[PDB]
Amino acid sequence: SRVCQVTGKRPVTGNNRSHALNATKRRFLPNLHSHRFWVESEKRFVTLRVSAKGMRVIDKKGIDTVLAELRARGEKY
Amino acid sequence: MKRTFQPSVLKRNRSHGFRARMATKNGRQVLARRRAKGRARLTVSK
Amino acid sequence: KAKELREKSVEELNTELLNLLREQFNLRMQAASGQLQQSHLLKQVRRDVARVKTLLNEKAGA
Amino acid sequence: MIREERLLKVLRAPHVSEKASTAMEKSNTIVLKVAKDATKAEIKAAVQKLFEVEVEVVNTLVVKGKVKRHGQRIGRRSDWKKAYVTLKEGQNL
Amino acid sequence: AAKIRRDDEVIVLTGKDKGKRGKVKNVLSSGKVIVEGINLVKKHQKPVPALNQPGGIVEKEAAIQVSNVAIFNAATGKADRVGFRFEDGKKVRFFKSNSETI
RNA sequence: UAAGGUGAUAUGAACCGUUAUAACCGGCGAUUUCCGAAUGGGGAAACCCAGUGUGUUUCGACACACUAUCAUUAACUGAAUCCAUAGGUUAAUGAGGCGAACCGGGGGAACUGAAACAUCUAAGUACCCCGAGGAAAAGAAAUCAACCGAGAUUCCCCCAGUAGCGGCGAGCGAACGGGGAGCAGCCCAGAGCCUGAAUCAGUGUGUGUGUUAGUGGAAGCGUCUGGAAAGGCGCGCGAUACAGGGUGACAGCCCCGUACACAAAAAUGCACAUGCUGUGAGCUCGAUGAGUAGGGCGGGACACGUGGUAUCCUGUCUGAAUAUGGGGGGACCAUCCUCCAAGGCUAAAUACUCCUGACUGACCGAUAGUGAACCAGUACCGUGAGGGAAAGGCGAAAAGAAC
RNA sequence: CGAAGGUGUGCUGUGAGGCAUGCUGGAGGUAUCAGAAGUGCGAAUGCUGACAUAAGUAACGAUAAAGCGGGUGAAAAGCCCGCUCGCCGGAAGACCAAGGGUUCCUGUCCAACGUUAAUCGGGGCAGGGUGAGUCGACCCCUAAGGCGAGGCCGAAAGGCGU
Ligand SMILES: [Mg+2]
Ligand SMILES: [Mg+2]
Ligand SMILES: [Mg+2]
Ligand SMILES: [Mg+2]
Ligand SMILES: [Mg+2]
Ligand SMILES: [Mg+2]
Ligand SMILES: [Mg+2]
Ligand SMILES: [Mg+2]
Ligand SMILES: [Mg+2]
Ligand SMILES: [Mg+2]
Ligand SMILES: [Mg+2]
Ligand SMILES: [Mg+2]
Ligand SMILES: [Mg+2]
Ligand SMILES: [Mg+2]
Ligand SMILES: [Mg+2]
Ligand SMILES: [Mg+2]
Ligand SMILES: [Mg+2]
Ligand SMILES: [Mg+2]
Ligand SMILES: [Mg+2]
Ligand SMILES: [Mg+2]
Ligand SMILES: [Mg+2]
Ligand SMILES: [Mg+2]
Ligand SMILES: [Mg+2]
Ligand SMILES: [Mg+2]
Ligand SMILES: [Mg+2]
Ligand SMILES: [Mg+2]
Ligand SMILES: [Mg+2]
Ligand SMILES: [Mg+2]
Ligand SMILES: [Mg+2]
Ligand SMILES: [Mg+2]
Ligand SMILES: [Mg+2]
Ligand SMILES: [Mg+2]
Ligand SMILES: [Mg+2]
Ligand SMILES: [Mg+2]
Ligand SMILES: [Mg+2]
Ligand SMILES: [Mg+2]
Ligand SMILES: [Mg+2]
Ligand SMILES: [Mg+2]
Ligand SMILES: [Mg+2]
Ligand SMILES: [Mg+2]
């Protein structure tokens, strides 16, 4: 599914509002990308389905910190 | 002339049988409704 | 019965069970040929088999 | 292959009729009601131990119980197994 | 718990046989009793070929409501009522009028 | 608990029992085919076919046990590729499926209303989906207030159809404050000192008490009519019992009850007391939740439709300060007041009824009341989802009509 | 020593109605003054049931066709036996499959069913009847297609697939 493995960001629903204020149901999808992260501690690359926001979270916290959250959640990588 | 009901037990069971109902979520809902109604026959069987 | 059968051993109860099952067979043959006047005997034999089997069960895993 | 407890429960009743009488007189065959789940091997062994006679061959069929209508509601008699137990030339019972 | 029992001498309180006495022959689960010489009927019994049995008008006791009979207190010659008490480790019946065990 | 019994149509047959293994009622056990989550594999449900391990005064074939998937944990094993990791096998433990309503969450209509219709309405309704509990959710202030003060959450009554929102149409519709039900507060973001010190859960025992069988339970007779008396008439009696039902017509005193008084071998609920395993109390010195708050863009939520619009959530792009600090007080600024976000837990008052027991009704009484008083979710119809009836009353007693 | 209800009659009220009483019925009814409403039917091509009408009318289902003798029986055009006559014969015969499910055979019965009578029946009731190593199924093998450990994908449900 279109779910960020880091933040949990998923498709949300809302409306397209026209100039005439006609509401039509829509979705806002997360900016998802499958990215290979180098994990020094495991001497292996880990491919995660992450939003650009989640990628910034990994830049701040570090991949080991983020992967530890995934283990605690039971979420495999 | 040729009428709409042309029998076949194999096609009867494959299309409406117990196992066919059990195979999908919506078919298990058919069985659940029929059980709540208190139906004697849930499906056509042997 | 039930108290009298409880005193018997596992080997003894297995013998009585075989005897009751032989009697059950002979009574069924007698009933089926229309030769059994005492219809009540079938229920007595059937419930004795039940008593023997119940006691064998409480002696095997207790 | 066998067990006495099983053999004692396998034979249910002699079946009486004109066909059963003629099968005995002409072919030395006894007609029985046997347990529904009884196999030809079980019926052979049970007749040999309990009736003390030698069995040549066992033939079996399943009889479908008749349905009777009682107004709007139906009744159904039980299906049962019939055995044609042929005994060897030397006849006893 | 039952106030009227098989073999008791009872007196009829209600019906065609009011005042008459008789022995309880059987007590039925319906709350009815058969009492000897009481509530007689003359049934037109149909013939049964399976006996080669002919038909016949048969006189028999018909069941009477148990509430329609009273325990007969022979000692007082009167209809009585039953009470219950424990004498020894056993429950007993007693006549309400004279407090005597049955 | 008992003098009667072997459920019904439903007799009859053969029997069981009467002072205590007849039956009947309740507690705990045993047995519990096959299908069904169905779980050894398969499958057109109730069937077809196996592997492995065991048994055979007969060690052929049958009987019996185990063998599904996934998750966590452990042991053995083990690639590309040296280590490693993946993978593989086995074992332990758990899950799965079903089912009323209430409950939290993910999605989410339209008819309709606007006397047309698109903003708006219907309505976060119907429905679909996920999950949970006896309740759920919420919850101990970055909350209000107004310079006086209040002190978590939930629910009820007001405030008030007010202030507002609104093609300022149709409609939508607060809060502040007041009266009430109920009330309870805690822990982590860490170390030391003293150590198992408050609490909570699992669970042995003990007592109280509740449930699942039960026990006792007052007092009326004569006469008349009548097929029959409970009715009329006469005279009695009980009542902490004249609730109600039955009995050949309407019974306080005939029967079952009712008021009142009692009872458990066994299992179980709730309390306290107490044993045990695990958890930690108190004190001192600290620490104080960052891709967060804030912002731009698009939406959504707030009674509040972008409006002069504060507050909340966030799909996208960004991005602080650090108690000499930060949030809020409905654009915004100053002053002042008030609170301390980015961690978590928590009972009550609140919502509901598939079911169990007791009781009640100016509710129905067979075209009514359930669709169904009755063998009804049946018969019947339809490929199917599904739809879905009609149908109660002899008599007090079958004495159901011998001949 | 006769309630409600039903069916008559008499009196009474402006009327909706009321009272009395004969007969039927067989156990319930309720003054008065208040109280509450599922409170009044001729219509809605109203709803359910019952019963008329047309009318003893149409029809009795292929125009292949019957006749007679004897029988059984309460009754015979129709059933049984017999002799003829006629019809089909690439079927209107025989055998499979599918589908049905006892309709099969024997005895017995005739209400209803059978477009008539019915002694007859695929109708009622009872009993009987289906016997496999080599006929079919199961079984081994695959087709289209289905399902599908892991997996890939998707708000959830799910979709696809090794
Ligand atoms: Mg053979
Ligand atoms: Mg066969
Ligand atoms: Mg008592
Ligand atoms: Mg399976
Ligand atoms: Mg299986
Ligand atoms: Mg297979
Ligand atoms: Mg290696
Ligand atoms: Mg579940
Ligand atoms: Mg409109
Ligand atoms: Mg639960
Ligand atoms: Mg909670
Ligand atoms: Mg202050
Ligand atoms: Mg409102
Ligand atoms: Mg208040
Ligand atoms: Mg208070
Ligand atoms: Mg009493
Ligand atoms: Mg009467
Ligand atoms: Mg903080
Ligand atoms: Mg904020
Ligand atoms: Mg303006
Ligand atoms: Mg201000
Ligand atoms: Mg907090
Ligand atoms: Mg209840
Ligand atoms: Mg009804
Ligand atoms: Mg009526
Ligand atoms: Mg009335
Ligand atoms: Mg009246
Ligand atoms: Mg009035
Ligand atoms: Mg009318
Ligand atoms: Mg009119
Ligand atoms: Mg005409
Ligand atoms: Mg004419
Ligand atoms: Mg004509
Ligand atoms: Mg006639
Ligand atoms: Mg038939
Ligand atoms: Mg025939
Ligand atoms: Mg006819
Ligand atoms: Mg027939
Ligand atoms: Mg899978
Ligand atoms: Mg697939």
PDB file of N, CA, C and O (backbone and C1' of nucleotides) in Angstrom, chain G residues 104-133:
ATOM      1  P     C G 104     -44.443 -47.582 -10.930  1.00  0.00           P
ATOM      2  O5'   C G 104     -42.904 -47.741 -11.230  1.00  0.00           O
ATOM      3  C5'   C G 104     -42.424 -48.026 -12.555  1.00  0.00           C
ATOM      4  C4'   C G 104     -41.438 -49.146 -12.487  1.00  0.00           C
ATOM      5  C3'   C G 104     -42.020 -50.454 -12.006  1.00  0.00           C
ATOM      6  O3'   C G 104     -42.506 -51.198 -13.144  1.00  0.00           O
ATOM      7  C1'   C G 104     -40.078 -49.939 -10.733  1.00  0.00           C
ATOM      8  P     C G 105     -43.910 -51.979 -13.117  1.00  0.00           P
ATOM      9  O5'   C G 105     -43.660 -53.169 -12.077  1.00  0.00           O
ATOM     10  C5'   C G 105     -42.979 -54.349 -12.508  1.00  0.00           C
ATOM     11  C4'   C G 105     -42.872 -55.342 -11.384  1.00  0.00           C
ATOM     12  C3'   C G 105     -44.167 -55.694 -10.702  1.00  0.00           C
ATOM     13  O3'   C G 105     -44.896 -56.654 -11.433  1.00  0.00           O
ATOM     14  C1'   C G 105     -42.570 -55.259  -9.064  1.00  0.00           C
ATOM     15  P     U G 106     -46.497 -56.642 -11.370  1.00  0.00           P
ATOM     16  O5'   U G 106     -46.800 -57.186  -9.900  1.00  0.00           O
ATOM     17  C5'   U G 106     -46.635 -58.546  -9.587  1.00  0.00           C
ATOM     18  C4'   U G 106     -46.888 -58.781  -8.118  1.00  0.00           C
ATOM     19  C3'   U G 106     -48.256 -58.347  -7.602  1.00  0.00           C
ATOM     20  O3'   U G 106     -49.309 -59.264  -7.963  1.00  0.00           O
ATOM     21  C1'   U G 106     -46.629 -57.603  -6.098  1.00  0.00           C
ATOM     22  P     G G 107     -50.827 -58.749  -8.038  1.00  0.00           P
ATOM     23  O5'   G G 107     -51.226 -58.549  -6.521  1.00  0.00           O
ATOM     24  C5'   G G 107     -51.462 -59.643  -5.660  1.00  0.00           C
ATOM     25  C4'   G G 107     -51.614 -59.143  -4.235  1.00  0.00           C
ATOM     26  C3'   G G 107     -52.813 -58.247  -3.990  1.00  0.00           C
ATOM     27  O3'   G G 107     -54.026 -59.008  -3.825  1.00  0.00           O
ATOM     28  C1'   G G 107     -50.909 -57.257  -3.007  1.00  0.00           C
ATOM     29  P     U G 108     -55.417 -58.430  -4.368  1.00  0.00           P
ATOM     30  O5'   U G 108     -55.713 -57.227  -3.379  1.00  0.00           O
ATOM     31  C5'   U G 108     -56.149 -57.441  -2.049  1.00  0.00           C
ATOM     32  C4'   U G 108     -56.086 -56.144  -1.268  1.00  0.00           C
ATOM     33  C3'   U G 108     -56.972 -55.039  -1.795  1.00  0.00           C
ATOM     34  O3'   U G 108     -58.317 -55.171  -1.362  1.00  0.00           O
ATOM     35  C1'   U G 108     -54.822 -54.174  -1.426  1.00  0.00           C
ATOM     36  P     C G 109     -59.514 -54.733  -2.344  1.00  0.00           P
ATOM     37  O5'   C G 109     -59.646 -53.177  -2.051  1.00  0.00           O
ATOM     38  C5'   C G 109     -59.912 -52.678  -0.719  1.00  0.00           C
ATOM     39  C4'   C G 109     -59.538 -51.196  -0.624  1.00  0.00           C
ATOM     40  C3'   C G 109     -60.272 -50.281  -1.589  1.00  0.00           C
ATOM     41  O3'   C G 109     -61.558 -49.956  -1.111  1.00  0.00           O
ATOM     42  C1'   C G 109     -57.993 -49.746  -1.600  1.00  0.00           C
ATOM     43  P     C G 110     -62.757 -49.706  -2.141  1.00  0.00           P
ATOM     44  O5'   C G 110     -62.440 -48.252  -2.711  1.00  0.00           O
ATOM     45  C5'   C G 110     -62.358 -47.099  -1.838  1.00  0.00           C
ATOM     46  C4'   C G 110     -62.069 -45.854  -2.663  1.00  0.00           C
ATOM     47  C3'   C G 110     -63.081 -45.587  -3.784  1.00  0.00           C
ATOM     48  O3'   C G 110     -63.575 -44.263  -3.673  1.00  0.00           O
ATOM     49  C1'   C G 110     -60.862 -45.453  -4.607  1.00  0.00           C
ATOM     50  P     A G 111     -65.127 -43.974  -3.656  1.00  0.00           P
ATOM     51  O5'   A G 111     -65.197 -42.493  -3.087  1.00  0.00           O
ATOM     52  C5'   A G 111     -64.341 -41.485  -3.535  1.00  0.00           C
ATOM     53  C4'   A G 111     -64.113 -40.471  -2.442  1.00  0.00           C
ATOM     54  C3'   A G 111     -63.348 -39.255  -2.881  1.00  0.00           C
ATOM     55  O3'   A G 111     -64.237 -38.300  -3.358  1.00  0.00           O
ATOM     56  C1'   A G 111     -62.350 -40.135  -0.934  1.00  0.00           C
ATOM     57  P     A G 112     -64.052 -37.655  -4.780  1.00  0.00           P
ATOM     58  O5'   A G 112     -62.708 -36.823  -4.635  1.00  0.00           O
ATOM     59  C5'   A G 112     -62.613 -35.677  -3.821  1.00  0.00           C
ATOM     60  C4'   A G 112     -61.150 -35.318  -3.643  1.00  0.00           C
ATOM     61  C3'   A G 112     -60.327 -35.292  -4.916  1.00  0.00           C
ATOM     62  O3'   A G 112     -60.539 -34.083  -5.645  1.00  0.00           O
ATOM     63  C1'   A G 112     -59.143 -36.460  -3.281  1.00  0.00           C
ATOM     64  P     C G 113     -60.434 -34.066  -7.228  1.00  0.00           P
ATOM     65  O5'   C G 113     -58.966 -34.586  -7.478  1.00  0.00           O
ATOM     66  C5'   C G 113     -57.827 -33.707  -7.388  1.00  0.00           C
ATOM     67  C4'   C G 113     -56.590 -34.427  -7.875  1.00  0.00           C
ATOM     68  C3'   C G 113     -56.665 -34.939  -9.301  1.00  0.00           C
ATOM     69  O3'   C G 113     -56.345 -33.929 -10.216  1.00  0.00           O
ATOM     70  C1'   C G 113     -55.822 -36.632  -7.911  1.00  0.00           C
ATOM     71  P     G G 114     -57.160 -33.792 -11.557  1.00  0.00           P
ATOM     72  O5'   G G 114     -56.860 -35.113 -12.356  1.00  0.00           O
ATOM     73  C5'   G G 114     -55.565 -35.425 -12.901  1.00  0.00           C
ATOM     74  C4'   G G 114     -55.695 -36.698 -13.703  1.00  0.00           C
ATOM     75  C3'   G G 114     -56.857 -36.671 -14.704  1.00  0.00           C
ATOM     76  O3'   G G 114     -56.481 -37.267 -15.906  1.00  0.00           O
ATOM     77  C1'   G G 114     -57.040 -38.567 -13.347  1.00  0.00           C
ATOM     78  P     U G 115     -56.214 -36.461 -17.235  1.00  0.00           P
ATOM     79  O5'   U G 115     -57.347 -35.317 -17.228  1.00  0.00           O
ATOM     80  C5'   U G 115     -58.701 -35.597 -17.574  1.00  0.00           C
ATOM     81  C4'   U G 115     -59.618 -34.665 -16.807  1.00  0.00           C
ATOM     82  C3'   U G 115     -61.109 -34.925 -17.000  1.00  0.00           C
ATOM     83  O3'   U G 115     -61.764 -34.700 -15.753  1.00  0.00           O
ATOM     84  C1'   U G 115     -60.662 -32.690 -17.558  1.00  0.00           C
ATOM     85  P     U G 116     -62.288 -35.922 -14.891  1.00  0.00           P
ATOM     86  O5'   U G 116     -63.427 -36.527 -15.777  1.00  0.00           O
ATOM     87  C5'   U G 116     -64.670 -35.886 -15.853  1.00  0.00           C
ATOM     88  C4'   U G 116     -65.711 -36.854 -16.356  1.00  0.00           C
ATOM     89  C3'   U G 116     -65.761 -38.164 -15.602  1.00  0.00           C
ATOM     90  O3'   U G 116     -66.470 -37.992 -14.422  1.00  0.00           O
ATOM     91  C1'   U G 116     -65.899 -38.567 -17.916  1.00  0.00           C
ATOM     92  P     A G 117     -66.190 -38.907 -13.164  1.00  0.00           P
ATOM     93  O5'   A G 117     -66.604 -40.363 -13.681  1.00  0.00           O
ATOM     94  C5'   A G 117     -67.951 -40.851 -13.453  1.00  0.00           C
ATOM     95  C4'   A G 117     -68.081 -42.304 -13.821  1.00  0.00           C
ATOM     96  C3'   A G 117     -67.218 -43.265 -13.026  1.00  0.00           C
ATOM     97  O3'   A G 117     -67.808 -43.579 -11.815  1.00  0.00           O
ATOM     98  C1'   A G 117     -67.001 -43.776 -15.275  1.00  0.00           C
ATOM     99  P     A G 118     -66.938 -43.565 -10.500  1.00  0.00           P
ATOM    100  O5'   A G 118     -65.818 -44.667 -10.728  1.00  0.00           O
ATOM    101  C5'   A G 118     -66.031 -46.037 -10.743  1.00  0.00           C
ATOM    102  C4'   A G 118     -64.923 -46.711 -11.556  1.00  0.00           C
ATOM    103  C3'   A G 118     -63.583 -46.893 -10.889  1.00  0.00           C
ATOM    104  O3'   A G 118     -63.627 -48.053 -10.076  1.00  0.00           O
ATOM    105  C1'   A G 118     -63.278 -46.200 -13.136  1.00  0.00           C
ATOM    106  P     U G 119     -62.982 -48.151  -8.601  1.00  0.00           P
ATOM    107  O5'   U G 119     -62.003 -49.399  -8.771  1.00  0.00           O
ATOM    108  C5'   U G 119     -62.056 -50.528  -7.952  1.00  0.00           C
ATOM    109  C4'   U G 119     -61.937 -51.800  -8.783  1.00  0.00           C
ATOM    110  C3'   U G 119     -60.987 -51.779 -10.007  1.00  0.00           C
ATOM    111  O3'   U G 119     -60.242 -52.996 -10.033  1.00  0.00           O
ATOM    112  C1'   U G 119     -63.158 -52.515 -10.641  1.00  0.00           C
ATOM    113  P     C G 120     -58.634 -53.051  -9.981  1.00  0.00           P
ATOM    114  O5'   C G 120     -58.168 -52.138 -11.166  1.00  0.00           O
ATOM    115  C5'   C G 120     -57.819 -52.675 -12.454  1.00  0.00           C
ATOM    116  C4'   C G 120     -57.359 -51.566 -13.358  1.00  0.00           C
ATOM    117  C3'   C G 120     -56.255 -50.718 -12.799  1.00  0.00           C
ATOM    118  O3'   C G 120     -55.024 -51.349 -12.937  1.00  0.00           O
ATOM    119  C1'   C G 120     -57.871 -49.291 -13.707  1.00  0.00           C
ATOM    120  P     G G 121     -53.805 -51.006 -11.952  1.00  0.00           P
ATOM    121  O5'   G G 121     -53.466 -49.514 -12.344  1.00  0.00           O
ATOM    122  C5'   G G 121     -52.893 -49.186 -13.607  1.00  0.00           C
ATOM    123  C4'   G G 121     -52.523 -47.737 -13.595  1.00  0.00           C
ATOM    124  C3'   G G 121     -51.660 -47.353 -12.431  1.00  0.00           C
ATOM    125  O3'   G G 121     -50.317 -47.717 -12.732  1.00  0.00           O
ATOM    126  C1'   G G 121     -53.347 -45.719 -12.767  1.00  0.00           C
ATOM    127  P     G G 122     -49.268 -48.057 -11.601  1.00  0.00           P
ATOM    128  O5'   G G 122     -48.700 -46.624 -11.202  1.00  0.00           O
ATOM    129  C5'   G G 122     -48.062 -45.841 -12.156  1.00  0.00           C
ATOM    130  C4'   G G 122     -47.409 -44.631 -11.515  1.00  0.00           C
ATOM    131  C3'   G G 122     -48.344 -43.545 -10.991  1.00  0.00           C
ATOM    132  O3'   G G 122     -47.691 -42.886  -9.947  1.00  0.00           O
ATOM    133  C1'   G G 122     -47.074 -42.689 -12.768  1.00  0.00           C
ATOM    134  P     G G 123     -48.250 -42.929  -8.464  1.00  0.00           P
ATOM    135  O5'   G G 123     -49.664 -42.209  -8.608  1.00  0.00           O
ATOM    136  C5'   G G 123     -49.841 -40.834  -8.303  1.00  0.00           C
ATOM    137  C4'   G G 123     -51.086 -40.651  -7.465  1.00  0.00           C
ATOM    138  C3'   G G 123     -51.093 -41.448  -6.171  1.00  0.00           C
ATOM    139  O3'   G G 123     -50.356 -40.781  -5.189  1.00  0.00           O
ATOM    140  C1'   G G 123     -53.120 -41.813  -7.246  1.00  0.00           C
ATOM    141  P     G G 124     -49.739 -41.575  -3.975  1.00  0.00           P
ATOM    142  O5'   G G 124     -50.996 -41.948  -3.113  1.00  0.00           O
ATOM    143  C5'   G G 124     -51.595 -41.040  -2.204  1.00  0.00           C
ATOM    144  C4'   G G 124     -52.473 -41.831  -1.258  1.00  0.00           C
ATOM    145  C3'   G G 124     -51.734 -42.889  -0.455  1.00  0.00           C
ATOM    146  O3'   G G 124     -51.097 -42.299   0.673  1.00  0.00           O
ATOM    147  C1'   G G 124     -53.640 -43.862  -1.381  1.00  0.00           C
ATOM    148  P     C G 125     -49.675 -42.806   1.180  1.00  0.00           P
ATOM    149  O5'   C G 125     -50.007 -44.253   1.737  1.00  0.00           O
ATOM    150  C5'   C G 125     -50.709 -44.410   2.953  1.00  0.00           C
ATOM    151  C4'   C G 125     -51.042 -45.864   3.189  1.00  0.00           C
ATOM    152  C3'   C G 125     -49.873 -46.818   3.186  1.00  0.00           C
ATOM    153  O3'   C G 125     -49.120 -46.744   4.376  1.00  0.00           O
ATOM    154  C1'   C G 125     -51.552 -47.741   1.888  1.00  0.00           C
ATOM    155  P     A G 126     -47.511 -46.909   4.330  1.00  0.00           P
ATOM    156  O5'   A G 126     -47.313 -48.492   4.315  1.00  0.00           O
ATOM    157  C5'   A G 126     -47.910 -49.334   5.320  1.00  0.00           C
ATOM    158  C4'   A G 126     -47.936 -50.797   4.869  1.00  0.00           C
ATOM    159  C3'   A G 126     -46.624 -51.370   4.355  1.00  0.00           C
ATOM    160  O3'   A G 126     -45.768 -51.717   5.427  1.00  0.00           O
ATOM    161  C1'   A G 126     -48.348 -52.008   2.889  1.00  0.00           C
ATOM    162  P     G G 127     -44.181 -51.646   5.266  1.00  0.00           P
ATOM    163  O5'   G G 127     -43.862 -52.886   4.302  1.00  0.00           O
ATOM    164  C5'   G G 127     -43.845 -54.222   4.825  1.00  0.00           C
ATOM    165  C4'   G G 127     -43.844 -55.265   3.713  1.00  0.00           C
ATOM    166  C3'   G G 127     -42.623 -55.291   2.840  1.00  0.00           C
ATOM    167  O3'   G G 127     -41.528 -55.953   3.449  1.00  0.00           O
ATOM    168  C1'   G G 127     -44.492 -55.328   1.461  1.00  0.00           C
ATOM    169  P     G G 128     -40.044 -55.473   3.105  1.00  0.00           P
ATOM    170  O5'   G G 128     -39.822 -56.045   1.638  1.00  0.00           O
ATOM    171  C5'   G G 128     -39.800 -57.457   1.401  1.00  0.00           C
ATOM    172  C4'   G G 128     -39.999 -57.741  -0.076  1.00  0.00           C
ATOM    173  C3'   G G 128     -38.843 -57.344  -0.971  1.00  0.00           C
ATOM    174  O3'   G G 128     -37.851 -58.359  -0.999  1.00  0.00           O
ATOM    175  C1'   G G 128     -40.807 -56.489  -1.891  1.00  0.00           C
ATOM    176  P     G G 129     -36.306 -57.976  -1.007  1.00  0.00           P
ATOM    177  O5'   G G 129     -36.105 -57.323  -2.436  1.00  0.00           O
ATOM    178  C5'   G G 129     -36.114 -58.119  -3.602  1.00  0.00           C
ATOM    179  C4'   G G 129     -36.047 -57.236  -4.827  1.00  0.00           C
ATOM    180  C3'   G G 129     -34.851 -56.321  -4.889  1.00  0.00           C
ATOM    181  O3'   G G 129     -33.708 -57.019  -5.305  1.00  0.00           O
ATOM    182  C1'   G G 129     -36.773 -55.125  -5.507  1.00  0.00           C
ATOM    183  P     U G 130     -32.282 -56.460  -4.940  1.00  0.00           P
ATOM    184  O5'   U G 130     -32.048 -55.450  -6.122  1.00  0.00           O
ATOM    185  C5'   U G 130     -31.611 -55.868  -7.387  1.00  0.00           C
ATOM    186  C4'   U G 130     -30.833 -54.727  -8.021  1.00  0.00           C
ATOM    187  C3'   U G 130     -29.569 -54.313  -7.269  1.00  0.00           C
ATOM    188  O3'   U G 130     -28.666 -53.827  -8.201  1.00  0.00           O
ATOM    189  C1'   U G 130     -30.921 -52.471  -7.443  1.00  0.00           C
ATOM    190  P     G G 131     -27.509 -54.717  -8.791  1.00  0.00           P
ATOM    191  O5'   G G 131     -26.903 -55.406  -7.464  1.00  0.00           O
ATOM    192  C5'   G G 131     -25.819 -54.860  -6.750  1.00  0.00           C
ATOM    193  C4'   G G 131     -25.070 -55.971  -6.006  1.00  0.00           C
ATOM    194  C3'   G G 131     -24.066 -56.773  -6.846  1.00  0.00           C
ATOM    195  O3'   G G 131     -22.948 -57.160  -6.015  1.00  0.00           O
ATOM    196  C1'   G G 131     -25.599 -58.247  -5.921  1.00  0.00           C
ATOM    197  P     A G 132     -21.646 -56.263  -5.933  1.00  0.00           P
ATOM    198  O5'   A G 132     -20.837 -56.661  -7.255  1.00  0.00           O
ATOM    199  C5'   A G 132     -20.297 -57.954  -7.440  1.00  0.00           C
ATOM    200  C4'   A G 132     -19.351 -57.966  -8.633  1.00  0.00           C
ATOM    201  C3'   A G 132     -18.085 -57.135  -8.470  1.00  0.00           C
ATOM    202  O3'   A G 132     -17.098 -57.686  -9.288  1.00  0.00           O
ATOM    203  C1'   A G 132     -19.293 -56.289 -10.274  1.00  0.00           C
ATOM    204  P     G G 133     -16.068 -58.793  -8.817  1.00  0.00           P
ATOM    205  O5'   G G 133     -14.705 -58.044  -9.082  1.00  0.00           O
ATOM    206  C5'   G G 133     -14.355 -56.888  -8.309  1.00  0.00           C
ATOM    207  C4'   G G 133     -13.168 -56.191  -8.930  1.00  0.00           C
ATOM    208  C3'   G G 133     -13.257 -56.013 -10.439  1.00  0.00           C
ATOM    209  O3'   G G 133     -13.770 -54.721 -10.752  1.00  0.00           O
ATOM    210  C1'   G G 133     -11.323 -57.229  -9.939  1.00  0.00           C
TER     211        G G 133
END
